[PDB]
Paper text:
[name] is a prokaryotic ATP-binding cassette (ABC) transporter required for heme assembling in respiratory cytochrome bd oxidase, a promising target for drug discovery. In our structures, [name] and [name] form a heterodimer with each subunit composed of one transmembrane domain (TMD) and one nucleotide-binding domain (NBD). The overall fold of [name] belongs to the type IV family of ABC transporters, commonly known as exporters.
The TM1 of MsCydD is short and the Elbow Helix (EH) is missing while the EH of EcCydD is longer than that of [name] and other type IV ABC transporters. Superposition of TMDs in apo MsCydDC shows that the conformation of TM4 is highly bent in [name]. In the apo structure of MsCydDC, there is a “lateral gate” formed between TM4D and TM6D near the cytoplasmic side. Thus, it is wide enough to let heme pass through. However, MsCydD lacks the whole EH and the gate is largely open in the apo structure. In the heme-loading structure, the two axial His residues are 4.8 Å away from each other, which is perfect to clamp the iron ion. However, in the apo state structure, the corresponding His residues are 6.8 Å apart and they can no longer coordinate to the iron center. (ii) It enters the inward-open apo state of [name] through the wide-open lateral gate between TM4D and TM6D.
Residue numbers in the entry:
A (entry chain A): 6 to 317, 327 to 507
B (entry chain B): -5 to 26, 33 to 505
The structure:
Amino acid sequence: HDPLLRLTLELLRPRLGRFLLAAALGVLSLGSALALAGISAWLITRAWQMPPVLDLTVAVVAVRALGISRGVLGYCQRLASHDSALRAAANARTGLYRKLADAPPDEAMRLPSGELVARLGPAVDELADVLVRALLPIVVAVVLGCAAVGVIAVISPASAAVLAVCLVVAGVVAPALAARAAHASETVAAEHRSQRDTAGMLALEHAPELRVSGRLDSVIATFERHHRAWGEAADRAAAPAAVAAAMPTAAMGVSVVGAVIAGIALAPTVAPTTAAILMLLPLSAFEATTALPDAAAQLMRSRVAARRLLELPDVATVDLAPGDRLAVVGPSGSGKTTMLMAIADRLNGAGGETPQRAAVFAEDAHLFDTTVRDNLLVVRGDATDTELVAALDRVGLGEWLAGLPDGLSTVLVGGAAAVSAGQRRRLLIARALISAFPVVLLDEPTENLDAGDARQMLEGLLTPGALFAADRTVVVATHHLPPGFDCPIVRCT
Amino acid sequence: SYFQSNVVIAGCTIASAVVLAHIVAGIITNPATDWAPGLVALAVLWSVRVVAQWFQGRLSQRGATAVIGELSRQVLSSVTTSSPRRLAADRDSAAAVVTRGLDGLRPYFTGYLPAVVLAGILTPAALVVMAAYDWQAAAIVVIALPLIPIFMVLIGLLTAERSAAALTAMTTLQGRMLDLIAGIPTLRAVGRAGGSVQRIAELSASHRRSTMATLRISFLSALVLELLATLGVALVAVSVGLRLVFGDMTLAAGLTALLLAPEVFWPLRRVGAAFHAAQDGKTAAEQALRLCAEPHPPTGHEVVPAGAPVIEVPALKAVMEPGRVTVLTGPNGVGKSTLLQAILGLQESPCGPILVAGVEVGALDRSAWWGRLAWMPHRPVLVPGTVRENLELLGPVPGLDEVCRSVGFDEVLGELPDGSETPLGRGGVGLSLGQRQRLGLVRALGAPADVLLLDEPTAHLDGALEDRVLAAIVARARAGATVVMVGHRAPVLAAADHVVTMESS
């Protein structure tokens, strides 16, 4: 039981009715094309031995109807298969997001927010792509292979074995070899690829002081040599991809040669029409196979995406009182924020209580690209505009709000990019002020702030009567504590 | 051998179809000779076609790798010129390009270019051969062929109103989803933890129906291509069968036309299938090419006279004479790194013109000018490796011992287990920030240079080391060199004979 299979049933199975609908439409389209080829050969051969024009009427009407049906059914099948795959992906995304809303402290924090997007965006696309390049190619290919082997088998069960062996060889060995070559290419020489992140991340932010000296061209030579080595290694590893590229043509050639050889020794036995059909079908039965040179590649990509999706320190205890001020500081490498969430967890006491007491405010808080009113009512949606304006003025955003064309209704396209970093942290501080949590926990609230303001904001926040008054607890995990100050110190290790 | 290989493939497809049709016609009419020549001809035709396909694959792989390498090298070289004004803005794009961002051009060079070349070669040649064997089927196919562009243009012009609206709704809703999923941890530690689950439901519903509309509009091209490439064969078959029943056309010609219609109509379908997989590579190539042509370095050949020149800034009334210590003070980020990098001549001077030794920097010969100078930047050069090499990238050090003694690098080299041989990581890993700065002074202060520029020389340094480096810099200035810093601290301010107060705006 591989994780891909586990995730397949996990994703709320795609409502198999519309899976089989797409499979049937694809089989109908490709079988219609194959039957058009066969009926075409039969019509030509029958018209050769001069008959009266009575059966040619039904043969001709069948030919024209089959052509038009092939076109329209191909289009409809493409639409239906895409519909099924993308509906499945959407429901899987909704379910996975639902699972990311659980009370216990799951991996929902052990991961950042940007790469959480980098998962939830591409992973659902990959899972959709495993329903377009695994339903269609494999299912339609096996059905059409069976239906085209049987037609030759009933005529003669002697060359049908060769056709089946050849179809299996093409449609299995060729994509398997292509996938293996592609996989082995991108992992081979995974040490000269370090030179990419060495040079391109060396001589792209370090350009001027490299340019003043004559060391630029030395770097150019020293990474070009290793890039060339990587290219040679990748070529050597991906050489067996050309064999897989050329295999289907050799398959078709062997198939048609075998068909002609078999038809030579069976022409006098049967009618001319059957001989022509047996001779001309093999060259037109390989259209389904060519649709899956990437099906194995898509399988590998979806497998790695499924593994990535499946992938989805202790601190001391500190006693707290309702109204104390803490100035927790520590070196880079200490669980200061982890201590913050530990205090929040022990204060909240897990689920079972409605009036949540402690809520951590991380520095990397996302900024919604909505109106400022909506962006600020996330913590509390029952705050009047007067309170928001007063908070913005008291944190240093009255002048920023005054220039806004829509006031509090500014949409702020792009999220955090719509405002400055200091402005964004000011909005975060205002949001923390708005929230009515009995215990408020801050994580570096004085970063990226103004030089003449950050000290004052830190002083006011850690003052028990400047911004948060009396019964409100403020815990700050900062790095710029003033040399002369107060409040207890819980310096970690 | 691209065009040669494609010509070989086209020839061995057309000839294989013709030979097969003739063999079938010959051994249907006479079911009693032709087995030896024709069969061997067909076998060798298929064999050479296979060999040509494999050789084409290898050649395309090699060519794509070479093109990727050359393009990456050219992009990196071009972006690394002077004028860091554009560099600070396009470094993200350049870093994206020389990364797993150009590997998407491999499909463009693998499955699209050979497809379009084969479409351009095989289709007219197969049309010619079919016309030679039978002109009515060729006429039908020809009438069909300029009916793909007409219908495609008609469809894409009649319905070019819903596609744009559907795409706009698609991208807006997708951005809504991406930003909402981006902020889930923020909404986790508040009261509203699961109240947003309902919104994603109909947001997904609307996004998926919008993408349904755009997919329904955008597939019509495939429908048109399939319908025409199939109706062509259907009509060819009907015509050949209906006009062959009156004993007035050889079976071989009919079979040849019937077998050659799919060869005419296939490469266009292959190109259409392979097109959608090459849009990303073309975009990456366009982005890479858009950032190469613009830079064109200028400057003159004037040579500053021997000695330490006089630098003057009329805009800020700052004229700095040789042999003295100068400091710059002001707020953070008011064109001071820009001023320095301008007096290195990399970019234009924001604050008026700058005259070196009486002559403007625009007429300066930068090659010789850069050799008279010790430029210590905020972040020194720290290539992964050892300490010894990192001390030698910025040119050879003629007298590293006394410079290290003056700055105090010996206490750094002394504590290192291997002396100047301890391994050093990327960006300074295994090497302390203030001790990184000390390495910077070691590489900078020790150099033959009559002009000294330093940006905050006392970063991450204690009082004793600050005093030592200030004394060393003062001694270097007394050695007859123009030394200018930008330090904005009391020890730095009270260490230079002149103070410049460059202001904003």
